[PDB]
Amino acid sequence: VPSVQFVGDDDVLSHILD
Amino acid sequence: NALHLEPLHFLQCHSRNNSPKDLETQLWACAFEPAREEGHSGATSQTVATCGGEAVCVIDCQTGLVLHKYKVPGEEFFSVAWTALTVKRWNMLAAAGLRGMVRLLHVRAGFCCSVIRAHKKAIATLCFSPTHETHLFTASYDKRIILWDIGVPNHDYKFQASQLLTLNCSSVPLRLCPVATCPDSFLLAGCEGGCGCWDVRLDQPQKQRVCEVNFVFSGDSEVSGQRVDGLAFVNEDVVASKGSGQGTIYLWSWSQTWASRGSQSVLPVVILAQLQWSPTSLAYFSLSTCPDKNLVLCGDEEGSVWIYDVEHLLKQTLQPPTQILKWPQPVALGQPVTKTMVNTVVANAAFTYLTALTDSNIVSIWRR
């Protein structure tokens, strides 16, 4: 069973911007 | 495990304060992206948008990577929905919640195109027309459902939205569901006070419309007037709907019900079957369907996913689920997450990926 994977803001591949 | 589903990822990606300790933010909605090319079904889509807290994420189900994230300080996102526009296809992601604003994201290009101040109260849910890809329904705590035309984006990716219809509700709308066989003519909505049908034809001249038919599911006074918090078509004719505190999901015939109507504004539905679901009195466990596989899906207060293959049932007492997918208690910070609730469960059309959202800042992704 996979563990819970934390994805922080620096782990996101791209941030959507205004 | 008759459906042969296996847990693939448990993603903690809507954390408050970017904290690995957040195992509490409620995740509210999810939606698989359409195909990236016109003419493709998108049935095996492996890209899912989720929202919760201040964030919308777009996730690859296969790898578990968060491809895109949109964060708005002070927002609480309650609903996401995609629409495929022709500009070449642009897959637009609409997101909304507490602030009453619809935020239209061009995900691939990486930015929020436009914002519609649709309501002065929170948007509970959003739903696009399956046939008119610029038509967007917003359902709000102001007890309105508004039908918008978001229009075509100008050269600079800006949208000019207009209002086509206002549907007035006697209680707060929770769940939207266009009628499968005539999705630009009639709209179903599950509301705090039950399930209704509204005439959304634009060739009728009234612009503010009350419910055309309020439906009745039970002659029990214990359930009369109670919420309908899950609502979806299993196939072109059969609706699956539920409330809380009844241990039951109703399967009913759109066509037989509508044929019986006449001019009655309150109408008992023609029930085809009843499914056993969890007995919890807790509200806001929504259901969904996978029509190609004849499935109803509904999470519960223990974090299970109830799965019903209703094919044989609808070809020929409360019917049991085909499978109950128990919460597998994945480890976070080294400890099992022993308890959670799954309020939303959504699969792609081919049923190769299933997403179950929790009240624990966990996106569950299962593969078949």
From Swiss-Prot, chain A:
Signal peptide: none annotated. The lineage of its organism: Eukaryota, Metazoa, Chordata, Craniata, Vertebrata. Component of the origin recognition complex (ORC) that binds origins of replication. DNA-binding is ATP-dependent. The specific DNA sequences that define origins of replication have not been identified yet. ORC is required to assemble the pre-replication complex necessary to initiate DNA replication. Binds histone H3 and H4 trimethylation marks H3K9me3, H3K20me3 and H4K27me3. Stabilizes LRWD1, by protecting it from ubiquitin-mediated proteasomal degradation. Also stabilizes ORC3. It is found in: Nucleus. Belongs to the ORC2 family. Component of ORC, a complex composed of at least 6 subunits: ORC1, ORC2, ORC3, ORC4, ORC5 and ORC6. ORC is regulated in a cell-cycle dependent manner. It is sequentially assembled at the exit from anaphase of mitosis and disassembled as cells enter S phase. Interacts with DBF4. Interacts with MCM10. Interacts with LRWD1 throughout the cell cycle; this interaction, which occurs only with non-ubiquitinated form of LRWD1, prevents LRWD1 ubiquitination and hence stabilizes the protein. Interacts with POLQ. This is Origin recognition complex subunit 2. It comes from the Eukaryota.
